[PDB]
Amino acid sequence: FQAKPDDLILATYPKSGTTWMHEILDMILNQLIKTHLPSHLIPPSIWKENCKIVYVARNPKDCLVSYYHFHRMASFMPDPQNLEEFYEKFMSGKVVGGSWFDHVKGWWAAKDMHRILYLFYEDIKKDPKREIEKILKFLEKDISEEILNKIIYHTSFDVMKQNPMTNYTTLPTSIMDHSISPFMRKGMPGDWKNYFTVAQNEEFDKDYQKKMASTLTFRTEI
Ligand SMILES: Nc1ncnc2c1ncn2[C@@H]1O[C@H](COP(=O)(O)O)[C@@H](OP(=O)(O)O)[C@H]1O
């Protein structure tokens, strides 16, 4: 894969803000390549050319829950069975895409050597103006207040949810059935609290602490 110096790359672990951020980057730019690869598997061409990369990470509890429901509604994805069973496989990194942990850490470290803007799903929810302003400084692109507010409006969850071009409702019920769980489900940090039992959560915090020791921190609420 021969990369071009101007190509802009969107990199996420699944269920972390791909669709959302693709839309932000889409509008700002008016070549955008997206990938779910872990840093160690990016083609070397992309580093040598010094492509700008936007990475989006999401707190792993919401990511896990989002990934569960998505499994429920996608035909091409394995049966998740239970949130309990799913948790075990998510924490093990025995899910499509592999380990969230390795993903987010590897990209976190990669930003010491490489032109990467590393953003947080939760920071984008809390203050899209602030996050989108970093993107603009990163792309050395300059945009009117009028258009910046337009982007914030256009890429808000409520608006994207009604947008056929982005909500994945232009796919047959038999590949994604939205009656089970919409692809645009809740879009809310802290939603995981409605699904983790207190005991599931204490178990998580004990595995997470071990598996992270990463100056990477997350918000699990806003
Ligand atoms: N415009 C938006 N704002 C906030 N969250 C969004 C969004 N568009 C999609 N999402 C959320 O991002 C997740 C999908 O991520 P990806 O595009 O990488 O698969 C889903 O999470 P939830 O299932 O937790 O709501 C989806 O609702």
Side-chain angles (χ1 to χ4, degrees), residues 1 3 5-30 32-47 50-71 73-87 90-91 93 95-114 116-125 127-128 130-136 138-140 142-149 151-178 180-185 187-199 201-205 207-209 211-213 215-218 220-222:
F1 176 79
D6 302 43
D7 292 338
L8 178 71
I9 301 188
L10 177 53
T12 61
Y13 180 83
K15 320 314 304 172
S16 300
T18 325
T19 312
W20 189 13
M21 183 52 54
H22 180 43
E23 196 65 5
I24 294 167
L25 298 182
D26 191 283
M27 307 211 81
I28 292 168
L29 284 156
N30 325 353
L32 175 36
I33 300 178
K34 59 187 178 172
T35 191
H36 292 297
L37 286 179
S39 57
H40 69 284
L41 286 175
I42 277 295
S45 175
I46 275 160
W47 306 126
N50 205 26
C51 307
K52 294 189 202 207
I53 299 167
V54 176
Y55 184 83
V56 189
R58 190 168 185 198
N59 83 76
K61 300 166 171 185
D62 284 310
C63 175
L64 180 158
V65 165
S66 181
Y67 212 14
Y68 166 63
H69 287 296
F70 177 71
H71 276 69
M73 71 90 83
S75 313
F76 64 94
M77 303 291 294
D79 207 331
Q81 307 263 296
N82 296 130
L83 182 54
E84 307 96 56
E85 294 205 335
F86 190 69
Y87 159 96
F90 184 95
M91 301 291 286
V95 293
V96 166
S99 172
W100 173 89
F101 293 89
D102 290 341
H103 204 281
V104 299
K105 294 195 294 185
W107 281 102
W108 187 247
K111 98 178 172 80
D112 195 60
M113 315 263 347
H114 299 117
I116 283 158
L117 183 73
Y118 197 108
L119 301 173
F120 293 81
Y121 182 89
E122 298 79 6
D123 294 348
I124 312 168
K125 253 293 184 194
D127 199 333
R130 178 183 192 159
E131 297 321 288
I132 293 155
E133 288 274 23
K134 298 193 212 168
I135 296 181
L136 291 170
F138 185 57
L139 302 180
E140 304 174 46
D142 200 277
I143 274 187
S144 57
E145 206 72 50
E146 206 168 48
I147 293 174
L148 170 57
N149 283 330
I151 296 191
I152 293 165
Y153 167 78
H154 195 215
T155 62
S156 61
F157 183 86
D158 289 359
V159 178
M160 290 192 74
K161 186 167 171 78
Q162 302 310 292
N163 187 11
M165 288 306 323
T166 59
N167 66 2
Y168 287 96
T169 60
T170 74
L171 284 180
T173 185
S174 61
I175 292 185
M176 296 202 189
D177 186 336
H178 296 272
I180 293 158
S181 182
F183 180 96
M184 300 287 170
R185 191 179 56 95
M188 258 303 312
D191 189 54
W192 65 266
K193 293 175 188 215
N194 299 305
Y195 304 94
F196 277 28
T197 63
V198 163
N201 196 39
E202 291 180 359
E203 190 185 328
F204 189 102
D205 281 355
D207 294 342
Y208 184 89
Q209 203 204 329
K211 291 172 154 149
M212 301 289 267
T215 75
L216 201 38
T217 71
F218 299 91
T220 58
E221 353 174 340
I222 69 153

